[PDB]
Design a protein around this ligand. Structure first.
Ligand SMILES: Nc1nc2c(ncn2[C@@H]2O[C@H](COP(=O)(O)OP(=O)(O)OP(=O)(O)O)[C@@H](O)[C@H]2O)c(=O)[nH]1
Ligand SMILES: Nc1nc2c(ncn2[C@@H]2O[C@H](COP(=O)(O)OP(=O)(O)OP(=O)(O)O)[C@@H](O)[C@H]2O)c(=O)[nH]1
Ligand SMILES: Nc1nc2c(ncn2[C@@H]2O[C@H](COP(=O)(O)OP(=O)(O)O)[C@@H](O)[C@H]2O)c(=O)[nH]1
Ligand SMILES: Nc1nc2c(ncn2[C@@H]2O[C@H](COP(=O)(O)OP(=O)(O)O)[C@@H](O)[C@H]2O)c(=O)[nH]1
Ligand SMILES: [Mg+2]
Lengths: 427, 50, 430, 154, 429, 427
C-alpha cells in the first residue's frame, strides 16, 4: 500500500510520461479506455502503487501533468493512451516559459504552482501510505526546469519524511537544442541537491549512442528514446508492484546507494537491449545480463564509468532466476576489476530479485550506479556556465525577472562543491 | 514497433501466461530431471554404437 | 503436553517459515486446508473440530512477503490475525526497525504471543527466525527479543538467525545492521544457531548437484534442520532429547551460545541408488567442514560441545561406535576441559521429503548442532568490515536521523570485541 | 463464485470461484474434501455424466477439464484468442460439451478429447449461458444483450 | 566443456572461414538456416532453443567480402555483429593494418572476443586464419595477436597462415608484409602451421585432376585439414588428441613452432574405386613431399617431431605397424635427440563430403602436422626477396608515411635472420 | 573381508578399469544393472573385496576413477558396465594434462588431488580392514603418470602398512604413441620406487605380440589388449575371493617376490591364451600350462626373460589340479635350465592353488616374475631420456610448471640406480 504520486514537468516530462504510463498500463493489463483486460491476478494485487480505482472498473493514474504551454497537453491528450489521465489533472499555463529559467521559477511560476500544489495535496491526501513523489522533467528547458524544481522545493517542506525519485535529462556536450542550456542546468542543480532525495540522471546524447550502437537503429526519434527511459522508470519500482525472492522498494535503494546525504545523483541502464538482427542469436541468461549491465556504453549518462570508481551500486533484477547466479555474478564483477570499485566499502553492490519480468521478456534488470565518474558531467556543464557568465551573456533576460546576479555566484559555488566532494572520495 | 520488446520469435519472449508463473525451484527441478533422462539416452545410444 | 512457538521476523524468516510449515504439514499428514484425513501438538493447535492451526506469528513491516502467504496455497492454514503486517518496511535500517517504525508493531506482536502462550499448557521454548543483515530482521528482531526477555523470564529462545557471508552478500549496510543485532542476541537469546547463505550454496551446488540454487532450494533443507531438532518432541525414540536439554549441554558458559549446524545424508535422488547410508558413514560426513551450514572451517578451532540428532533406523549401538571413531580422529579436535563432548539423540521417524523437492528419500539422518571456537572468525571478519566502514563514517546519517545516537556503533563494536576475545580465552589450553 | 453443480449423488456439491480455486464439498459434514487450484481466475464449470470430468473455463482464454482424483489438469486447451471465454455447461448424456466466449461464437467440444463440432457465430453480444436440452435436440445459448439463440444439434 | 574461438583475418581468412564453417555445419547436421533437424558444442553455441550460432568472428577492413557472407547462403547462420567490417581496406600495407586504420577496428574485435570468452565455459584455444601477404592479414592479424597475449595469458593460440609462394604470387609488396608479420608471430603464436598456395595448386592438379582450380577449390581441402585436427574433441575415439596436446608434442623449443601440413587421401570420385585406401598407404602418402601443404622439400631437412591424426575405421595395430615401417626408411631422417617422434590420434568419424566438392567419400584419413628443420628454407628464400626489396628502398614511402618508422624494417629483418640461425643450429647433430 | 580399493587414472586407466570391472563382475555374476544373477553360492561368499553392498541389494564397485579430461569419464559411462559405478567417485578435471608429467603432478593435478584423497579416505574407512591399494595407469601419459604418482606418493605416506599394486603400462621400444614418453616415464618410475610396494610392468607392443602370434587375431581391437590385462589383474586377487588348497594374498606374493626393497618391478603373463582354431587340439592340462607360462612370448613386458636370470617367481594356479603335479613342474623348470635362475635363492618359484576356475574355463594360471632382465626396458627409457635431456629439448613445457632441471637429474640418477642394482645380480 505504498503509492507513488507522479509529477510531469514540461515538454520533455509530458512526452516521457506519455510513454511511461503506456508501459505500466500494458504491464498491468489496462486497456487505453481504462478497464481491466489483464489476464492474471498478480496485476490486480498492486494497482494502488500507480493507479486509482474508479467507478465502472476504471483505473486512472496518479499523474499530475503540468506545463506552461497548452500545445504539449493537446498532443498527449489527443494521442493514444491519452484518455486514461484525469482531465482535471491537466493543469497548464498560457504564457509559456520561453527557455527562461527565471520566468519558470519567479514570474509565471508563481500563479501556477499554487494551482498544481492543490492537485498534489488532493492526490497525496486521498491515498493512504505515501512512499514518495516521482517526477520526470528536464534541466535544459525552462518549463520543466524552473517550475519543475520549484515544485520539488515547495513539496519538500510540506512532506519531508517521504521519498523523492527525480528523473532529469541534462544538456549535452555534443548537440545542443537550446542556447541557455548551461544557465538553466546549473540553476536547477542548485535546487536539486538540497531538496531531492535521490536523483536519476539521464541525457539525450547517451540515448542516441545506445540506440545507434546496441540497437542498430540508425535514425532514432523521440519515440524510441522515450521508451528506453520508460523501460527503466518501471524497473526502479518493480519490486513494489510484484512479489519477489528479495524485495526492494525506494527506501531500500536509497539506504544502500548514498553513503552521504549529498551524493544522491545516479546513472541508470537497462540490460536486455538488442538489435532486431541480433534477437534470434542472443540467449537471456544471468551471466549475459550482468555483462551488459556493467558495460560503459550501456549506461545512460555521458560520464564514462571507467574513469571514476563506483562508490556504491545496486541491481534490480526481474524474472525467474536463481539468487546464487545473482550473487555470484555481482561478486565476480567486484573481483575481476577491483580497481574500479571504492576500497573503504566492502560489497558495494546491492541486489534484489523481482519475480515478474516486463512485458514480453524472460528476464530483465535495471542498474543504478552511484559513481564518482558523474563529476565530469557536472563539471562539463559548469565550464559551459562559467564561459557564458564571465561576459554577462544572456543575463539581461534573467535579471529582468527580479533574479539578481548574486545568486549566480552561489549557484556555481555548490556546483563546484558537488564536484569537489565527488573527487575527494575517488582518491 | 517497440524497442525493448522482442519480435515473437526470439529466445527473450514470454507469453502473457508464461511471464506470470512463479515456480523457480520447480522449473529447475524439472529441467534437471529432463537433462538427466536425456543424458541417459545419449549414454545408451553411445553404448549401442560401441 | 509440550508446545513451542515459532516466531519469524522479516523477509528471510517468512520464506524459511513458508518452507518450514510446508514440511511440518507433510510430517503430520495435514493437508494445506488445515484438515487431517497426538504427534501434532508441538506445532499445531487442534481447534474446534478438524481444524489444525499452526503455532506461529509471521510479522514483517513489508506487506509483499506476507500477502503472498495470505494469497497462496497455505492461506487457509494460518489464522488471519497471526500474520502481522505493516505499512512500510524498515529499509535496511536498524534504527527504523528498533525506534521509529518498529514501536507501533512490537506492541501488537506481544499480544499475539500472549494469546498463543495462553493456549499452550506446557510451553517449552521459542524459535526465532530472522536475518541480521536486514532492517526488519535485525531491528525488529532486537525489539521482540528484548520484550520477550522481560515478559517471559527463564523461557527458552532459540536463535535460528541468518548471517552475512564473507564473500557473498546482497546489501551494503549488512555490516552495520549485523553488529547492532549482536548487541541484542547475546543477552536475550538462550541458544543461537548461526546460518550462512553461502555455505548452503556450497551444499546445494555440491551435495545436491543443483547448478543454480535459489532461496527456495535453500530453505527446504534449512526447514529440515529445525524439523530434525524438534523430532523428539513429536515422535518416540531410544534417547529422547528436549528443547531445555540442548541448553544444558551445548552452552558451557552464558556468553557462549553460538551453534554451528550440519545435516548428514544430503543426497540427491539419482545419487541415492548407489550410496549406502550407514550410521557411521553419515556421522563422518556430518563433521565434514564442507557440510557445515555456516562458512567456517571448524578445523581452525576446538569443539566445546557437540549434539547429534539421529532419525530413522538407528540402533543405539552404531551411534556409540560412530562417536568413538570420530573422537579419535586427528583432523578433529575437542577442547581439553570437556573430555566427553557428545549428546546423542535418536528418533524413530525417518525424514520426510517434500513433493517436487531435491533431497532423496532416506532411512537415516544426522543433525549436528555444535559449539566450537571456530565461530570467533565469524565475528572477527564482521568486525573488520564494520571498522572499515565506520572509520570514514559511511551510511551513518541514515541511522542517526532515525533515532540512534552516534556512539551506539561504538557500544556495539566494543560489545562484539569482548565477544571476540572470550572465544580465544576459553578455547586456549590451561 | 461463478460455477456450481451437484454431484451424481445428493450428498456432494462442487463449486468454482474467481479465487483461482474449485472444490468438491460434503453436504452432511460441511467441510472440504479436496481443493484444486489454478493459475488464472475461473469463469465457469460443468460436471459430466457420472463423475468422469469436471470442466472449468478461465479468464485466460482456456478450457481445463479435470478428473476428480489425481490433482493435475487432465487436459487444458487455449482457444478463442480474440476475446474472453464466458460460460459453459454440460450435456446430460456426457458426450457433448458447450462453450461460450466473449467472441460472437459458441463451440461444441467432446469430453474425451477436444474436437470442434459446433457452429461459427450467431449471437451479437458476448455469451452468458448454455445448457443443452435434456434430449440433446438443441441448445439455448444467450448473448449479453437481449439476444437468445436456439440451436439444433447436428 | 571443450570449446575453441576461431578468428579469421583478411580476405583469405573470410574465404577459408566461409568454406570451413560450411564443413562444420555438415558433420553436426546444422542447417544453413541454423536449426538442427553434445558434439556440436566446440563450434556452434546453443543460444535459446533451436538455434546454433558459430563461435567465430569475421573481421576484415574491406567490406566487400563481409557483406557477401551477409547476403550469401549463410545469412541466418552467423550472429550479425560477429562479422566485423571496416570502411576501407589496408591496401597491401602492413603499416596501415597495424597503425593507421587497424587501431580503431581492433577495439571492436576484443569486445566481441570478450563476449565469446565469457559465454563458453572452458576455452581450449584460439584458431587464427590470415594471409601474411596482404595488409589486413599482416597488419590487423599482428595487432589482434598482440592483444590476445596480454588479455588471455598462457592460453594456447593456433596459427594457420597462408604464406607467400616462391614461384607464383599475386602481390608485389609481399616480401614486406611477410617479414614484418613473422617478427610478431614468433613470440605470440604457440603453434604456427604454414600453408602455401602453389603447394595446394599442385595438389589439386595431380591428386584431384582439376585442371582449372580456383580459390573455392583450395579452401575446401584446407578446411578438411582444420576439421581433422579438431575432430578428436568433437567425436570420441580410441586415442584422443587435444588442442593443448599439440603444443606439448610438437615444439621442443619455444621459438621453433612452425610446422608443415599434409592431408593423406586426396582422391576424386573416379579414382576412388581403383585405389585400396589402406592405412599403410595413406600414412606413406602423407610423408611424400608432393602431398605437403607447403612448397618445401623435407628431404633436405630432418623431422624434429611428427603428429598423426586418424579419422574413420583405423584400428590401433596398423597405425603402429605403419609408423614402424616409416622409422626404418632412410629417406625420412630424424634428429638424434628425438628417437620417438610421433603422436598418434585415432578417431572413429569418417570425413564428411561437401555437396558439389571434388573429394570423394572415403573411410580412412590422416592429417600429418610435423615440425622440421627443412622449414628454414621457406624463410631463407623470402629472406632473399626482402633483401632485394630493402636494398634500394622500394615501396617504403607507403609504409613510413603511414605511421611506422623505417627502423622496424631492420628490426624485423634481424629477427628473421636470427630465426634462420636458430633453425640451422637445432638441426645440427 | 580383505578389501582391495581400485583406483584408475587417465584415459588408459579408465579403459583398463572398464574391462577390468566387466571381467570381475562377470565371474562374480553381477549384471550391468547392479543385481546378482549367479548360479553358484561361491560368488557371494567373498564379494566385499571388490563391491560395496548398497541399499536394495545393489553392488557398487570400490573404484575411484580420475582424469583431468572430463570427456573421458563420459566414455566410461558410455562403455558397457558403466552404470554400476558410483557417480560420486567420478572425480573429474576440466583442463587436461596433455602428455605433461608436470601439469598432472604440480600445477593442474594439485587442485584435483584434494578431492581424490577425500574419496579415498571415505572409501578406506568404510571397509573393515584394507588389504592394499590397486592402481592401473600409464607412465607415458600426463594424467596417469603425473597425477597417478602424486596419488601413490600421498596414499603411501598416509597409509604406510598397506600394500600397493601398480599395473602401470610403460612406454614401448618399437613404436611410441607420443614423443614425450621418456620425460614422463623416468619421472614416474622415480616416484614408483620409494612408494609402490610392488609394481607390475605392462607394454602395449608386448600385448600386440600376444594377440598376433598366440591368439591369431588379425585386427586386434584396442579393447582386446585390456581383456588380456583384465585377465591378469583378476588372477592376482584370485585366492582372496575364492577358496583354494594353497592360499596367497597380495602380501604373501610381496614377501616371496621381493628379496630387496627396491627390486619391486615385475613382469606378468596370463597362461591359457589359445586361439579358436587351436582350441580343440590342445589338452588343457597342468604341464601344458607351466611350459607355456615360462615361455618368453607370453610375458607382457618388452624385456625378454632369457637375457637375465630370474631372481624370484610366483605362480597362481586356478582350477581342479594336483598339488604334487603343480609343484613338480616348478622343480622341473628350475633344473632343466638352471642358468636362468639365481643361485643364492633356493626355490625361486612360489605357487598357490585356487579351487574356483574362471568362468567358462576349466583351468588357468597367472605368472608374476621378478627378474634382473627387466632392466633392459629401463636402460632403454634411460637411453631415450639421456638423448632428449642432454640437448634440453621438449623441456620448456616442463620447466614452465615449476620444476627445474635438477629434478630431471634426480630421476635420471635414480633410474640408473635401479639398473645398477639389477645388473649386479645378473652376474
Ligand atoms: N537463509 C535465507 N536468507 C534470506 C532469505 N531471503 C533473504 N535472506 C537474507 O536476508 C537479507 C535481506 O534482509 P532482510 O532482513 O531479509 O530484509 P527484510 O526482512 O525485508 O527487512 P527490511 O528490508 O528492512 O524490510 C539478505 O542478506 C539475505 O541474507 C532466504 O530465503 N533464506
Ligand atoms: N588459399 C587461399 N589463399 C587466399 C584466399 N584468398 C586470398 N588468399 C591469399 O591472400 C593473398 C592476397 O592478400 P590478402 O591477405 O587476401 O589481402 P586482404 O586480406 O584483402 O588484405 P588487404 O589487401 O589489405 O585488404 C593472395 O596472394 C592469396 O595467396 C583463399 O581464398 N584461399
Ligand atoms: N528524451 C526526450 N527528450 C526530449 C523530448 N522532448 C524534448 N527533449 C529534450 O529536452 C531538451 C529541451 O527541453 P524543452 O523541450 O525546452 O523543455 P521545456 O522547457 O518543457 O519546453 C532538448 O535537449 C531535448 O533533447 C522527448 O520527448 N524525449
Ligand atoms: N593396453 C592399453 N593401453 C592403452 C589404453 N589406453 C591408452 N593406452 C596407452 O597409454 C598411452 C597413453 O596414455 P594416456 O591415456 O594418454 O595417459 P594420460 O594422458 O596421462 O591420461 C599410449 O601409449 C597408449 O598406448 C588401453 O585401453 N589399453
Ligand atoms: Mg524489506
Amino acid at each position: 500500500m505504498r503509492e507513488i504520486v507522479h509529477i510531469q514537468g514540461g515538454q520533455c516530462g509530458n512526452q516521457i510520461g506519455a510513454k511511461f504510463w503506456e508501459v505500466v498500463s500494458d504491464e498491468h493489463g489496462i486497456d487505453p479506455t481504462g478497464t481491466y483486460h489483464g489476464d492474471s491476478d498478480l496485476q490486480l494485487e498492486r494497482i494502488n502503487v500507480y493507479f486509482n480505482e474508479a467507478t465502472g472498473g476504471r483505473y486512472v493514474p496518479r499523474a499530475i501533468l503540468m506545463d506552461l504551454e497548452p500545445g504539449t497537453m493537446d498532443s498527449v491528450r489527443s494521442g493514444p493512451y491519452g484518455q486514461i489521465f484525469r482531465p482535471d489533472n491537466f493543469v497548464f499555463g498560457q504564457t509559456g516559459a520561453g527557455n527562461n529559467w527565471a520566468k519558470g521559477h519567479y514570474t509565471e511560476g508563481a500563479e501556477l504552482i499554487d494551482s498544481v500544489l492543490d492537485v498534489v495535496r488532493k492526490e497525496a491526501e486521498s491515498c493512504d501510505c505515501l512512499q514518495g513523489f516521482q517526477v520526470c522533467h528536464s534541466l535544459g528547458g525552462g518549463t520543466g526546469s524552473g517550475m519543475g524544481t520549484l515544485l520539488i522545493s515547495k513539496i519538500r517542506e510540506e512532506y519531508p519524511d517521504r521519498m523523492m525519485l527525480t528523473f532529469s535529462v541534462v544538456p549535452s556536450p555534443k548537440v545542443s537544442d537550446t542556447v541557455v542550456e548551461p544557465y538553466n542546468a546549473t540553476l536547477s542543480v542548485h535546487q536539486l541537491v538540497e531538496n531531492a532525495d535521490e536523483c536519476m540522471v539521464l541525457d539525450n546524447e547517451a540515448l542516441y549512442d545506445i540506440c545507434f550502437r546496441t540497437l542498430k537503429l540508425t535514425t532514432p526519434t523521440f519515440g524510441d528514446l522515450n521508451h528506453l527511459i520508460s523501460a527503466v522508470m518501471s524497473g526502479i519500482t518493480c519490486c513494489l508492484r510484484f512479489p519477489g525472492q528479495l524485495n526492494a522498494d525506494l527506501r531500500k535503494l536509497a539506504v544502500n546507494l548514498i553513503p552521504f546525504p549529498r551524493l544522491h545523483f545516479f546513472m541508470v541502464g537497462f540490460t536486455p537491449l538488442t538489435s532486431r538482427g541480433s534477437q534470434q542469436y542472443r540467449a537471456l541468461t544471468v551471466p549475459e545480463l550482468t555483462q551488459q549491465m556493467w558495460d560503459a556504453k550501456n549506461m545512460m549518462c555521458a560520464a564514462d564509468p571507467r574513469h571514476g570508481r563506483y562508490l556504491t551500486a545496486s541491481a534490480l533484477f526481474r524474472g525467474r532466476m536463481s539468487t546464487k547466479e545473482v550473487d555470484e555474478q555481482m561478486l565476480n564483477v567486484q573481483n575481476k576489476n577491483s580497481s574500479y570499485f571504492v576500497e573503504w566499502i566492502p560489497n558495494n553492490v546491492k541486489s534484489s530479485v523481482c519475480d515478474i519480468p516486463p512485458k514480453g521478456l524472460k528476464m530483465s534488470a535495471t542498474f543504478i550506479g552511484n559513481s564518482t565518474a558523474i563529476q565530469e558531467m557536472f563539471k562539463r556543464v559548469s565550464e559551459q556556465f562559467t564561459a557564458m557568465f564571465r561576459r554577462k551573456a544572456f543575463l539581461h533576460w534573467y535579471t529582468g525577472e527580479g533574479m539578481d546576479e548574486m545568486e549566480f555566484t552561489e549557484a556555481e559555488s555548490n556546483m563546484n562543491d558537488l564536484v569537489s566532494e565527488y573527487q575527494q572520495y575517488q582518491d | 514497433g517497440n524497442p525493448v520488446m522482442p519480435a515473437r520469435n526470439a529466445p527473450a519472449f514470454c507469453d502473457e501466461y508464461d511471464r506470470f508463473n512463479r515456480d523457480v525451484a520447480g522449473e529447475m527441478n524439472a529441467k534437471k530431471q529432463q537433462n538427466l533422462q536425456k543424458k541417459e539416452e545419449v549414454y545408451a545410444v553411445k553404448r549401442a554404437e560401441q | 503436553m509440550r508446545e513451542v512457538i515459532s516466531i519469524h521476523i522479516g523477509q528471510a524468516g517468512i520464506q524459511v517459515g513458508n518452507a518450514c510449515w510446508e514440511l511440518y504439514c507433510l510430517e503430520h499428514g495435514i493437508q494445506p486446508d488445515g484438515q487431517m484425513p497426538d504427534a501434532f501438538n508441538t506445532f499445531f493447535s487442534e481447534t474446534g473440530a478438524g481444524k489444525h492451526v499452526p503455532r506461529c506469528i509471521f510479522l514483517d513491516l513489508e506487506p509483499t512477503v506476507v500477502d503472498e502467504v495470505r494469497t497462496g496455497t497455505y492461506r487457509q492454514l494460518f489464522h488471519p490475525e497471526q500474520l502481522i503486517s505493516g505499512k512500510e518496511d524498515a529499509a535496511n535500517n536498524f534504527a527504523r526497525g528498533h525506534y521509529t517504525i518498529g514501536k507501533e508493531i512490537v506492541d501488537l506482536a506481544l499480544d499475539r504471543i500472549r494469546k498463543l502462550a495462553d493456549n499452550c499448557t506446557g510451553l517449552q521454548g521459542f524459535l526465532v527466525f530472522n536475518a541480521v543483515g536486514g532492517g526488519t530482521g535485525s531491528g525488529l528482531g532486537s525489539l521482540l527479543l528484548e520484550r520477550l526477555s522481560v515478559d517471559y523470564g527463564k523461557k527458552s529462545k532459540l536463535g535460528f538467525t541468518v548471517y552475512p557471508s564473507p564473500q557473498v552478500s546482497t546489501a551494503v549496510v549488512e555490516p552495520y545492521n549485523s553488529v547492532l543485532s549482536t548487541h541484542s542476541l547475546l543477552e536475550h537469546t538462550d541458544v543461537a544457531v548461526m546460518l550462512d547463505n553461502e555455505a548452503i550454496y556450497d551444499i546445494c551446488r555440491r551435495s545436491l548437484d543443483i547448478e543454480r540454487p535459489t532461496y527456495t532450494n535453500l530453505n527446504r533443507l534449512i526447514a529440515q534442520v529445525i524439523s530434525s531438532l524438534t523430532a523428539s518432541l513429536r515422535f518416540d525414540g531410544a534417547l529422547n532429547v528436549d528443547i531445555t536439554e540442548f541448553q544444558t549441554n551445548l552452552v558451557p558458559y552464558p556468553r557462549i551460545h553460538f551453534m554451528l549446524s550440519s545435516y548428514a545424508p544430503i543426497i540427491s535422488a539419482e545419487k541415492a541408488y548407489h550410496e549406502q547410508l550407514s550410521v557411521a558413514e553419515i556421522t563422518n560426513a556430518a563433521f565434514e567442514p564442507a557440510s557445515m551450514m555456516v562458512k567456517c572451517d571448524p578445523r581452525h578451532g576446538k569443539y566445546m560441545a557437540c549434539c547429534l540428532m539421529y532419525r530413522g533406523d538407528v540402533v543405539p549401538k552404531d551411534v556409540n561406535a560412530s562417536v568413538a571413531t570420530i573422537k579419535t580422529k586427528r583432523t578433529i579436535q575437542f577442547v581439553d576441559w570437556c573430555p566427553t563432548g557428545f549428546k546423542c539423540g535418536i528418533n524413530y521417524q525417518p525424514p520426510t521429503v517434500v513433493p517436487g523437492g531435491d533431497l532423496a528419500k532416506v532411512q537415516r539422518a544426522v543433525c549436528m548442532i555444535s559449539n566450537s571456537t571456530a565461530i570467533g572468525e565469524i565475528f572477527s571478519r564482521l568486525d573488520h568490515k564494520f571498522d572499515l566502514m565506520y572509520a570514514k563514517r559511511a551510511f551513518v546519517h541514515w541511522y542517526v536521523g532515525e533515532g540512534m545516537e552516534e556512539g551506539e556503533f561504538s557500544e556495539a563494536r566494543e560489545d562484539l570485541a569482548a565477544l571476540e576475545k572470550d572465544f580465544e580465552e576459553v578455547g586456549a589450553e590451561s | 463464485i461463478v460455477g456450481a453443480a451437484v454431484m451424481a449423488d445428493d450428498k456432494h456439491v462442487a463449486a468454482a470461484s474467481e479465487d483461482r480455486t474449485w472444490s468438491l464439498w460434503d453436504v452432511g459434514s460441511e467441510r472440504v474434501r479436496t481443493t484444486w487450484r489454478g493459475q488464472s481466475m475461473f469463469r465457469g464449470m460443468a460436471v459430466s455424466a457420472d463423475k468422469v470430468s469436471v470442466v472449468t473455463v478461465t479468464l485466460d482464454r482456456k478450457i481445463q477439464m479435470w478428473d476428480v482424483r489425481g490433482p493435475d489438469p487432465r487436459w487444458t486447451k487455449v482457444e478463442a484468442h480474440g476475446k474472453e471465454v464466458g460460460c459453459v455447461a454440460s450435456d446430460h448424456r456426457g458426450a457433448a460439451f458447450a462453450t461460450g466466449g466473449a467472441d460472437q461464437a459458441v463451440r461444441v467440444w467432446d469430453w474425451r478429447n477436444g474436437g470442434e463440432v459446433g457452429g461459427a457465430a450467431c449471437h451479437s453480444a458476448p455469451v452468458a449461458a448454455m445448457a443443452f436440452s435434456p434430449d440433446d435436440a438443441g441448445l439455448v445459448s444467450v448473448a449479453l444483450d437481449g439476444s437468445t439463440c436456439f440451436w439444433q444439434l447436428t
